[PDB]
């Protein structure tokens, strides 16, 4: 494996970007009759969870390439506006269920969701994102904005950490606790 | 002789000042200096990362690109947004998309110093050195621009254009027209 701290790379940055371009084409098609324009009527991107800044930064630029202008708001007026909620990972769906339900109360013209990583096996309630870049199984991943204990968000790929990473850090946490 | 001037890429811009490629080239140069400068600190994921404090809403683009480049150069980070975890005894690098009057960074740095970080430095994507209202020098600057209003690379005009990949001069046409519309509202 490329990374000394990982056992597996699941998706490279290049694979993610290729899938993101395919999703951007669909979004450009789906919103083509919405008359989106900078200033007068951008697509409102609502980015949810701290780590989603990486995905949001790459995705709004790719959407711009495909002719979909955006404004961004972070959750870490939309009445009559088109809203696309972005999140780095969708797992239990408890976050997005709450965010979507709250945004609906402001009566946007439409609301859809776009997630970089779906763990469809992780649900605690039923929830389907309109747009999914990639799926993973029920494993804990880091990278592409996703962290372990606030570290590793900067890893360019989505990866599975080595067990020794959690073990060393637990032990150091114990150590610092006693001292 | 007759000079030929090609038209600008973007219908809303007068001039592209820095392309995404130029920005990333300069960010790699800066990342090498940062790696050299923090090589004496024994930084590590989890036990001792560099705390990146990202300031202002539009700085998410710069921050996303910069933490990944720093990772390539072996500088592990953790990111915090001001648009705060304990920083006492930690190295802090404050990131900001643009530095102009310096009033934001002066306040942010002074506040953070109260928590006694191990060190504090600043890294900015665009410095407008002629815009100062107080003296201020960033430790690390990706690019300088003259006193003109730019958008792109996370910088907005009234919340639009952050997604433009290049840093560009916004056409006066755009904000004169839109400004009167906002007045009308
Ligand atoms: N780093 C990381 N990797 C995972 O595989 C993973 N699976 C769940 N989570 C925690 C969180 C994701 O935390 C993401 P962040 O650090 O705040 O970007 C799941 O929240 C989505 P949901 O369960 O409400 O739908 C994960 N965090
Ligand atoms: N979009 C944009 N372009 C500029 O040229 C420019 N020059 C100043 N500003 C406004 C703000 C930058 O606003 C950045 P953002 O939309 O919140 O990412 C200057 O703040 C830095 P300082 O004056 O405290 O040092 C600008 N905003
Ligand atoms: Mg997390
Ligand atoms: Mg602004």
Author numbering:
A (entry chain B): 5 to 80, 103 to 205
B (entry chain A): -2 to 80, 101 to 202
Task: List sentences from the manuscript.
One potential new drug target is 6-oxopurine phosphoribosyltransferase (PRTase), an enzyme central to the purine salvage pathway and whose activity is critical for the production of the nucleotides (GMP and IMP) required for DNA/RNA synthesis within this protozoan parasite. For example, T. brucei has three 6-oxopurine PRTase isoforms whereas there is only one 6-oxopurine PRTase in humans. These enzymes catalyze the transfer of the ribose 5'-phosphate moiety from 5-phospho-α-D-ribosyl-1-pyrophosphate (PRib-PP) to their respective purine bases (hypoxanthine, guanine or xanthine). Here, we show that two of the three T. brucei isoforms of the 6-oxopurine PRTases are identified as HGPRTs as a reflection of their substrate preference for hypoxanthine and guanine and the third isoform is identified as HGXPRT reflecting that it uses all three naturally occurring bases. In both enzymes, the active site is situated at the interface of two domains referred to as the hood and core and is primarily comprised of three pockets identified as the purine base binding pocket, the 5′-phosphate binding pocket and the pyrophosphate (PPi) binding pocket.
To explain the mode of binding of the ANPs, crystal structures of HGPRT-I in complex with compounds 1, 2, 6 and 7, and HGXPRT in complex with compounds 2 and 7 were determined. In the HGPRT-I.6 complex the PPi binding site is occupied by the phosphonate connected to the attachment. This phosphonate interacts with the side chain atoms of D114, D173, R179 and two water molecules. In this complex the side chain of L53 points inwards towards the active site and the peptide bond between L53-K54 is in the trans conformation. This allows L53 to form hydrophobic interactions with three carbon atoms from the linker and attachments. However, in other crystal structures of HGPRT-I (e.g. in complex with GMP and IMP) the peptide bond between L53 and K54 can exist in the cis conformation, resulting in the side-chain of L53 being rotated out of the active site, allowing space for PRib-PP to bind. In addition, in HGPRT-I the L53-K54 peptide bond is in trans conformation and the side chain of L53 points into the active site, whereas in the human enzyme when compound 6 binds the equivalent peptide bond is in the cis conformation. Further, in the crystal structure of the human enzyme a sulphate ion fills the PPi binding pocket, whereas there is no sulphate in the HGPRT-I and HGXPRT structures. Compounds 3 and 6 are the most broadly effective inhibitors tested so far with Ki values lower than 1 μM for all three enzymes.
